[PDB]
Design a protein around this motif. Structure first.
Motif, mmCIF file in Angstrom:
data_model
loop_
_atom_site.group_PDB
_atom_site.id
_atom_site.type_symbol
_atom_site.label_atom_id
_atom_site.label_comp_id
_atom_site.label_asym_id
_atom_site.label_seq_id
_atom_site.Cartn_x
_atom_site.Cartn_y
_atom_site.Cartn_z
ATOM 1 N N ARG A 190 -43.581 31.765 -95.405
ATOM 2 C CA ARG A 190 -42.902 33.050 -95.265
ATOM 3 C C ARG A 190 -43.564 33.916 -94.200
ATOM 4 O O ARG A 190 -42.894 34.718 -93.542
ATOM 5 C CB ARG A 190 -42.856 33.774 -96.607
ATOM 6 C CG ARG A 190 -41.921 33.122 -97.599
ATOM 7 C CD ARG A 190 -41.629 34.026 -98.774
ATOM 8 N NE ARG A 190 -41.095 33.271 -99.898
ATOM 9 C CZ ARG A 190 -41.833 32.756 -100.871
ATOM 10 N NH1 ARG A 190 -43.144 32.925 -100.905
ATOM 11 N NH2 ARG A 190 -41.242 32.055 -101.831
ATOM 12 N N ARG A 191 -44.880 33.779 -94.021
ATOM 13 C CA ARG A 191 -45.527 34.433 -92.889
ATOM 14 C C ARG A 191 -45.063 33.847 -91.565
ATOM 15 O O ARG A 191 -45.069 34.552 -90.551
ATOM 16 C CB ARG A 191 -47.048 34.326 -93.004
ATOM 17 C CG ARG A 191 -47.735 35.630 -93.366
ATOM 18 C CD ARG A 191 -48.954 35.399 -94.239
ATOM 19 N NE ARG A 191 -49.976 34.611 -93.560
ATOM 20 C CZ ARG A 191 -50.693 33.656 -94.139
ATOM 21 N NH1 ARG A 191 -50.526 33.340 -95.412
ATOM 22 N NH2 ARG A 191 -51.602 33.003 -93.421
ATOM 23 N N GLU A 192 -44.665 32.579 -91.554
ATOM 24 C CA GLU A 192 -44.040 31.965 -90.390
ATOM 25 C C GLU A 192 -42.566 32.330 -90.252
ATOM 26 O O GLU A 192 -41.884 31.770 -89.389
ATOM 27 C CB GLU A 192 -44.173 30.442 -90.454
ATOM 28 C CG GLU A 192 -45.431 29.887 -89.831
ATOM 29 C CD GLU A 192 -45.623 28.417 -90.145
ATOM 30 O OE1 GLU A 192 -45.317 27.578 -89.274
ATOM 31 O OE2 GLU A 192 -46.071 28.097 -91.266
ATOM 32 N N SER A 193 -42.067 33.246 -91.085
ATOM 33 C CA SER A 193 -40.651 33.617 -91.136
ATOM 34 C C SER A 193 -39.759 32.425 -91.478
ATOM 35 O O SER A 193 -38.722 32.211 -90.850
ATOM 36 C CB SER A 193 -40.192 34.269 -89.830
ATOM 37 O OG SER A 193 -39.916 33.289 -88.848
ATOM 38 N N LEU A 194 -40.157 31.647 -92.478
ATOM 39 C CA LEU A 194 -39.359 30.556 -93.013
ATOM 40 C C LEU A 194 -39.126 30.784 -94.501
ATOM 41 O O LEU A 194 -39.833 31.568 -95.137
ATOM 42 C CB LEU A 194 -40.045 29.209 -92.779
ATOM 43 C CG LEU A 194 -40.267 28.841 -91.312
ATOM 44 C CD1 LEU A 194 -41.112 27.589 -91.190
ATOM 45 C CD2 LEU A 194 -38.940 28.657 -90.604
ATOM 46 N N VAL A 195 -38.121 30.105 -95.056
ATOM 47 C CA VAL A 195 -37.684 30.332 -96.425
ATOM 48 C C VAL A 195 -37.647 29.007 -97.176
ATOM 49 O O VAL A 195 -36.996 28.064 -96.727
ATOM 50 C CB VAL A 195 -36.304 31.009 -96.488
ATOM 51 C CG1 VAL A 195 -35.863 31.178 -97.933
ATOM 52 C CG2 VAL A 195 -36.332 32.343 -95.772
ATOM 53 N N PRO A 196 -38.323 28.876 -98.313
ATOM 54 C CA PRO A 196 -38.197 27.644 -99.096
ATOM 55 C C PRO A 196 -36.886 27.576 -99.870
ATOM 56 O O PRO A 196 -36.343 28.583 -100.341
ATOM 57 C CB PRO A 196 -39.401 27.702 -100.043
ATOM 58 C CG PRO A 196 -39.747 29.138 -100.131
ATOM 59 C CD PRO A 196 -39.407 29.741 -98.805
#
Ligand SMILES: [Zn+2]
Lengths: 76, 137, 97, 57, 38, 142
Positions: free
Chosen positions: C24-30
């Motif tokens: 999420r710090r990488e701007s990704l979503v699981p």
RNA sequence: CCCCGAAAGCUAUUUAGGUAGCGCCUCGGACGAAUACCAUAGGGGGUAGAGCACUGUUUCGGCACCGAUGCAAACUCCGAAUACCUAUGAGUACUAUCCGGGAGACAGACUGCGGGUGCUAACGUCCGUAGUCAAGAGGAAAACAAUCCAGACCGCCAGCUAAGGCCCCAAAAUCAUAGUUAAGUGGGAAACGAUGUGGGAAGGCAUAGACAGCUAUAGUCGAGUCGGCCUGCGCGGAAGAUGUAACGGG
């Protein structure tokens, strides 16, 4: 002046011998105010709901019966 | 001035306010709502002042849902009194606020009027807020 | 076929609390994909694409395509988790359809 | 089969069990290096005090 | 001149300007709208 | 006693002349203080003055960056009650340019009799001329 | 001169700044793995969190009930991490236990974490737990018992590092490569206010001519323009008494 300020002395209840330990006849296993645990095989119940061993062996806890009571027994 | 009709106990421990408001953070009753973004306390007088401001701005053409209730009593010592000698007397009631908690919702008014009312109410509150709208999920 | 989400495989070393916070710090979503006759698959989505899709109202009632590598899954969104205070999407559920 | 462990920080203010882990590995001072069997029992003591030891694996 | 922590446009003839690091409001129509932040 | 201290009778002081036109005040003052203390010589000794003589010319041409020309303040106190006097860089550089260098280098030299002796080797002049031609100073571009 | 080395707790007390038994220190004797750390295996729990199934409490609807929606130290349908008890085992270590001679101590302090009280005041007060001081020097914090690094047998004008640093006071980079700030911000503070500047994701209008200005929607001109969201660093808000005095100084 507050109307509070009372309390009773501690009673030191609880489990005295845990599962997997070996006991000698007469050893107290559980001190309890009510029957949180019930007496299984080779375990006796005192007048104040104390559970003690009546034979030498290994203590075992379990959940058993149609009411889901907790039992503690001694295996010889 | 909201306050419980009766309580089981009169005085309660201070406690600690930690964590996020996972419950009560979803718009449920109205279409637009205001929610807190930082934690704090909300007194009954603050709740009443904000409600009055919103109702006055929207001229009672819609419905305001209040989702915060002050069920926590706060005590203070009678002043000029030394430390000790028992707990103080109940003085006012508060509601613990965690980030994400929705405070007010409005039903049946335009978004512009609702946002104006919410901006008017936000000046009465001791914490930062934001505006949210209903969504599918 | 109208909605396509480009995703990457989320492996065991990328599962967990710390790994999810790094994602999420990488701007990704699981996200997780489950449904009849197949085992669940964990994927990683782009926050940008997820926000864009959620802005549309027909996204919640239409079959969408999640594309990872060459594999393609036809799913419908089932559940979403948002940040309580920031409203950012944090996790997605997808039921095979 | 064996690994080398070096103490890199002081143990004077650490927790009791952490000091006992250092002693049970046999480390005695900063810069000391010992060679121990590679077993789970030794690995537990090493992992508990990871923050002040260095392992040449 | 009003000296306030909060300075804002009042009407459509007010202008927000910055002079020497000071935010000011000047109004072409009403001199009573003149403001300075401080 | 294999490490030797410098002997004052065997110290050689050399004369250098530095032009201050366009230099930053502090970054010039650090080098001046270093050479006045003698930190550049292999016979450096903390209790012995081994430095050189420095002559600063065009003192009023020294520069400061940012807005310090108007904002940097110089204070002094006459020991009478309420006797705090204040000036700034812009006025002081025009009036007494040597005092600016004196303050800047005094703050960087040691505070004691040896520091007082060290700072006596710096000569500051506003003009482009100095009266020390007899000592034949060498141009030093620091 | 050499070795070891506490406590400021519990219980009782016409007791509370005294004393006694126990806890903690030391010395002698007996006895050696019975001890501890860690791994694996067995075990009970009702705390953190969470929840509304009970006890209370809360809002909005429909007809006390039904549907949505909150809260709880003295609520619980649930429920960890740790901690605690037992057995087996490798490695490491003078460990554990028993019997006696001698004590001191029973005014504690700060800091972090979990809390009661107090105003989520106090270098405040009362508990639990860990570290330090007490009884501990050295280095870093300007100076600074209780913070950080580290535990001083003696000598050396030898070397490597920790915390913390490398322009001068004052030992070591005016080191290297990318950006940001213009406020001496750095080197004290809030709600709130604002076209300060850097980055990012979208949206609107526009060379069948956009925005502003200008002439009576048309028309001169000749490309960008507009309004929001997220984010980095800054600005105002900011008044005190001996003298700059809120980077230790330059
Ligand atoms: Zn105006």
């Amino acid at each position: 002046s507050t109307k509070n300020g009372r309390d009773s002395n501690p009673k030191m209840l609880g489990v005295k011998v845990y599962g997997g330990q070996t006991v000698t006849a007469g050893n107290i296993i559980v001190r309890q105010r009510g029957t949180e645990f019930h007496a299984g095989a080779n375990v006796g119940m005192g007048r104040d709901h104390t559970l003690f061993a009546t034979a030498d062996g290994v203590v075992k806890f379990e959940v058993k019966g149609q009411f889901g009571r907790r039992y503690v027994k001694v295996e010889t | 001035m909201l306050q419980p009709k009766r309580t089981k106990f009169r005085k309660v421990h201070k406690g600690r306010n930690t964590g996020l408001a996972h419950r009560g953070s979803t718009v449920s009753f109205g279409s637009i709502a205001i929610k807190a973004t930082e934690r704090g306390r909300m007194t009954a007088r603050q709740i009443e002042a904000a409600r009055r401001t919103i109702s006055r701005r929207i001229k009672r053409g819609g419905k305001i849902f209040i989702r915060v209730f002050p069920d926590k009593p706060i005590t203070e010592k009678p002043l000029e009194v030394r430390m000790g000698n028992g707990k103080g007397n109940v003085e006012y009631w508060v509601c613990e606020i965690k980030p994400g908690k929705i405070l007010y919702e409005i039903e049946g008014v335009n978004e512009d009027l609702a946002r104006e009312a919410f901006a008017l109410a936000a000046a009465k509150l001791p914490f930062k807020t934001t505006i949210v709208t209903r969504t599918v999920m | 076929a109208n909605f396509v989400l480009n995703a990457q495989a989320r492996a065991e070393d990328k599962q967990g609390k710390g790994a999810s916070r790094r994602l999420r710090r990488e701007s990704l979503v699981p996200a997780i994909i489950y449904g009849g006759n197949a085992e669940p698959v964990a994927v990683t989505l782009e926050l940008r694409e997820l926000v864009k899709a959620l802005e549309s109202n027909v996204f919640f009632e239409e079959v969408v395509e999640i594309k990872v590598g060459d594999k393609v899954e036809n799913v419908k969104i089932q559940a979403l988790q948002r940040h309580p205070a920031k409203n950012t999407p944090m996790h997605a559920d997808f039921k095979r359809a | 089969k064996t690994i080398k462990v070096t103490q890199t920080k002081s143990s004077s203010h650490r927790l009791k069990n952490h000091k006992l882990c250092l002693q049970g590995l046999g480390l005695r001072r900063i810069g000391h290096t010992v060679e121990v069997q590679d077993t789970p029992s030794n690995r537990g003591m090493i992992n508990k005090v990871y923050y002040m030891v260095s392992v040449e694996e | 001149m009003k000296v306030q922590a909060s300075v804002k446009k009042i009407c459509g003839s007010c202008k927000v300007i910055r002079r020497n690091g000071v935010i000011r409001v000047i109004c072409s129509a009403e001199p009573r709208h003149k403001q300075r932040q401080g | 006693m294999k490490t030797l201290s410098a002997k004052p009778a065997e110290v050689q002081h050399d004369w250098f002349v530095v032009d201050a036109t366009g230099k930053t005040l502090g970054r010039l003052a650090t080098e001046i203080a270093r050479r006045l203390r003698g930190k550049h010589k292999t016979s450096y000794t903390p209790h012995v003055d081994t430095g050189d003589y420095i002559i600063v010319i065009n003192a009023e041409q020294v520069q400061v960056t940012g807005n310090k020309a108007l904002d940097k303040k110089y204070y002094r106190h006459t020991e009478f009650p309420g006797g705090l006097k204040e000036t700034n860089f812009e006025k002081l550089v025009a009036h007494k340019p040597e005092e600016i260098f004196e303050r800047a280098v005094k703050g960087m030299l040691p505070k004691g009799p040896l520091g007082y002796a060290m700072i006596k080797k710096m000569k500051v002049y506003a003009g482009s001329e100095h009266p020390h031609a007899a000592q034949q100073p060498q141009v030093l571009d620091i």
